[model samples]
Target: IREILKMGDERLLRIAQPVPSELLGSEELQRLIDDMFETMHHVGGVGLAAPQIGVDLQLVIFGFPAVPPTILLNPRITPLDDEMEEGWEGCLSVPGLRGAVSRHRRIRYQGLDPQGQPIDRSVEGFHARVVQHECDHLIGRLYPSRITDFSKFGFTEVL
Candidate 1:
């Protein structure tokens, strides 16, 4: 399993770099993607970013039973509406801490797949939240960073 960089790690605070087009299907790149998925699942996380694994690449993966696993490379999210929703979020990097974060209720996202093919979709609710959370890692931020109410930030077990 790849070691996930924790909150205190400076590496997690640095912005991730975009994956080069030339490396799309290479063995190394594919291995990293697989390992990230494995790590996210093993840790019971719905989403994970490349930087979370100490790899500074602009990549994220997320999904659930209702939503199939999706990969995003150099992704960009656009708000679909003015509505916002507050939801509890926890990060592998932050360990047990769960914070209430406000995010767009719906979004349009576009990014490249593992094969460097463009993928675009509109999502809302849990799916939108998961994508936004993962994308935050690429921009050198975390869920807690977006939390405006400290009262809502607490240990997951107690929250």
Candidate 2:
């Protein structure tokens, strides 16, 4: 997964926190999409959510197109099988924290593309973990929760 730089207790940029598709066909949604794209890009992130900047909504945007730019909104993940993959991860809100976490090796995901239509596909390898990690942010969860031991499994140094 890509590094998510923590905003910490700074209250984040909560202003753009999206509501659950209250108006799927409205201008507000478009604005939210635009703002989120700009915000994540400004931060130079592989992916991001409103909460990372202090907003709280089930919204997320990310890009790792091999060229490193992906954005997915209101994304959802459904595991394709019981297999799991463990990989390194970092968070934007927990600045100095990084570690290896296990996630589904393959998953079926659905989200709105830039055009705001339903897009569904299966993901594997690192991309699957990336999607899972960002999806966790919307629910107020962090990567540390996946660690079994902080000392042995987590990072104490920042670079």
Report every candidate's CA lDDT: 0.89, 0.68
What residue pairs are clashing in model 1? none
Candidate 2's C-alpha lDDT? Answer: 0.68
TM per candidate? 0.95, 0.75
lDDT of 1: 0.89
lDDT of 2 by residue, 70-92 (tens): 55667778999999877778765
- Model 2 TM-score? 0.75
Candidate 1 lDDT over 1-159, as tens digits, reads 788888978888898899998988688888988899899888888888998888989999988827779888999999999999999888888987888999999999999998989989999998888889999999899887899989999988888
Which has the greatest lDDT?
A: 1
**Model 1 off-target regions past 4 Å?**
none
- For candidate 1, the 10 contiguous residues with the lowest summed lDDT are 62-71
